[PDB]
Amino acid sequence: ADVPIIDLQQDHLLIVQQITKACQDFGLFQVINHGVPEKLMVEAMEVYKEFFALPAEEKEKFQPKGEPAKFELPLEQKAKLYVEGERRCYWKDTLAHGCYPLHEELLNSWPEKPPTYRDVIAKYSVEVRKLTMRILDYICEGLGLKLGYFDNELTQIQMLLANYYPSCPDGHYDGNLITLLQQDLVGLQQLIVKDDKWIAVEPIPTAFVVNLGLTLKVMSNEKFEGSIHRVVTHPIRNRISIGTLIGPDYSCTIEPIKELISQENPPLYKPYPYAEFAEIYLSDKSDYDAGVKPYKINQF
């Protein structure tokens, strides 16, 4: 029950109530009957299976200056293969690119092999964004904000991170606003902070896992939780997951949503530049919320 599964074809008010409770209590939930075509979800996963099976000489096309990219600024939207962290038996290869707006220069950075990549992944990205914006509107209703509150610079960046985890038999907040993750194998765990317990997020191949980022934790003034989650390498399979990470542009200023502040809900963060946060978030792993620690105020 600590990972709620929310049916998006229930009554609207029940959806709002269930999403709001999940956001307050956990910061992570799954959605089913969510309106994204299952056929397209299957096709996207098949595209990534094909992509990660390509020979090394194809992979080199995504290695800037001959080596994988790192998650560091500037974080370009053009498609690259990234590595992140070290684990010994890379433990994670990620193909990442922006998706929105889909400028010609951005699209022409995407893979051309496998040949269906651009058609499938463009359609997938449009559908996942539409679902994300629906979820953000349910969140607006739960917070008491007008519909469309997040339909601006706060959602300007849509990074697709397709992750490949080589098998081996022997945690973070996402820094952005909100993430949708498609998975088909065990490996994702969520931290239940109140119980200091890591628990599995059941793989439902036709669902999306929704997790709130550190930006939404700040903007909600901690009325919502951000999700701290981690991945366990599979002992048998090479696991692939598909994340759509939506959030602000690098030129944005972030602060607790001003309309929700009150005498009993004073701001817990001062305004900060997203780019400055992003540098710390990507560099400083000393604590899960290191990226926002410099901006905390009104602590008691």
Ligand X SMILES: CN1[C@@H]2CC[C@H]1C[C@@H](OC(=O)[C@H](CO)c1ccccc1)C2
Ligand Y SMILES: O=C(O)CNC(=O)C(=O)O
Residue 167 interacts with, from Na ion, Sr ion, Ni ion, none (CB under 5-8 Å by kind): Na ion
Residue with the two structure tokens 């309106």: 35
Does the footprint of ligand Y cover residue 231 (CB under 6 A)? Answer: yes
Q: Which is nearer to ligand Y, 15 or 75 (CB)?
A: 75
Task: Build a one-symbol-per-residue string for 262-281: x at contacts with ligand X by CB under 6 A, - elsewhere.
Answer: ----------------x--x
Q: Of 22-30, 133-141, 181-189, 262-270, which segment contacts ligand Y by CB under 6 A?
A: 181-189
The H-assigned helical ranges of the chain are 12-25, 38-52, 56-59, 104-107, 117-143, 214-219, 274-283
Phi, psi dihedral angles at 110 (to 5 degrees): -70, 160
Residues 6+ apart with CB under 8 A from 58: 113
Q: How far is the CB of 231 from Ni ion (least distance, A)?
A: 8
Q: Is 165 annotated as a binding residue?
A: yes
Residue 226 interacts with ligand Y (CB under 6 A)?
no
Closest distance to ligand Y from the beta carbon of 247 (Å): 12
Q: Does 161 bind ligand Y (CB under 6 A)?
A: yes
Q: Which of 127, 137, 174, 225 binds ligand Y (CB under 6 A)?
A: 174
Q: Say whether residue 152 binds Na ion (CB under 5 A).
A: no
Phi, psi of 65 (to 5 degrees): 55, 30
Tokens standing for residue 48:
């990534």
Give residue 185's identity as a one-letter amino acid code: L
35 binds Sr ion (CB under 5 A): yes
| Residue 176 near which of Ni ion, ligand X, Na ion, none (CB within 5-8 Å, type-dependent) | ligand X
**Angle 179-181-184 from CA coordinates, rounded to 5°:** 170
The yes or no reply on residue 127 touching Ni ion (CB under 5 A) is no
Q: What string of DSSP letters covers 94-145? A: EEEEE-SS--HHHHTTS--SSTTHHHHHHHHHHHHHHHHHHHHHHHHHHHTP
206 or 238: CB nearest Na ion: 238
Alpha-carbon distance 42 to 46, whole Å?
Answer: 6
| 188: contact with ligand Y by CB under 6 A | yes
Indicate left, alpha or beta for 240 from its phi (over 0: left) and psi (-120 to 50: alpha): beta
Binding site for ligand Y (CB under 6 A): 161, 163, 174, 181, 183, 187-188, 229, 231, 241, 243
Binding site for Ni ion (CB under 5 A): 174
Q: Which residues are annotated as a binding site for 2-oxoglutarate?
A: 163, 165, 239, 241
Binding site for Sr ion (CB under 5 A): 35
Binding site for Na ion (CB under 5 A): 167, 238
